[PDB]
Write a protein that binds this ligand. Structure first.
Ligand SMILES: [Zn+2]
Length: 129
DNA sequence: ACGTCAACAGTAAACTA
DNA sequence: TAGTTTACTGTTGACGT
């Protein structure tokens, strides 16, 4: 809880610095669905999860026995949880719930695409056991 | 109204400094 | 070492039948 809230607060300030370091400078009210997805793609550089391409032999193998030049991405579970924290952080800082940019349909569709593509590429299942 | 899903909450690990 | 945060887990509330 306390670690979760500080994690949420840090993500909210990280998203704030992201908007200020955006070029052109991006305001919160102008954070369209495309811009939120642009933010989620920007975070792939900090991911640690190997997502194999369809030409790599290790596609669908969660524990390859050799390195490959396939890119590292944010896992679906990281993005799913981050969206939950940012959804709350937006409303905890006075944002109207029905204007929540992290609740836009484009966010839901993107997370589903990441879930289905990574499950095939990684060979893992994101369903709750 | 169970059966699932959505909407966040919460924990674990290992990498960075 | 200790802090961070990606990655994985958990669950109340809401949805769907
Ligand atoms: Zn690969």
């Amino acid at each position: 809880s306390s670690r979760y809230e500080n994690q949420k607060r840090r993500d909210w300030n990280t998203f704030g610095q992201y908007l200020r370091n955006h070029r052109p400078p991006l305001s919160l009210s102008r954070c369209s669905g495309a811009h939120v997805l642009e933010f989620l793609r920007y975070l792939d550089q900090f991911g640690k999860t190997k997502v194999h391409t369809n030409i790599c032999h290790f596609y669908g193998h969660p524990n390859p026995p050799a390195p490959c030049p396939c890119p590292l991405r944010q896992a679906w579970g990281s993005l799913d949880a981050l969206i939950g924290r940012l959804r709350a952080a937006f409303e905890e800082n006075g944002g109207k719930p029905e204007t929540n940019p992290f609740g836009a349909r484009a966010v839901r569709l993107y997370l589903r695409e990441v879930r289905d593509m990574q499950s095939k590429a990684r060979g893992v299942s994101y369903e709750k056991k």
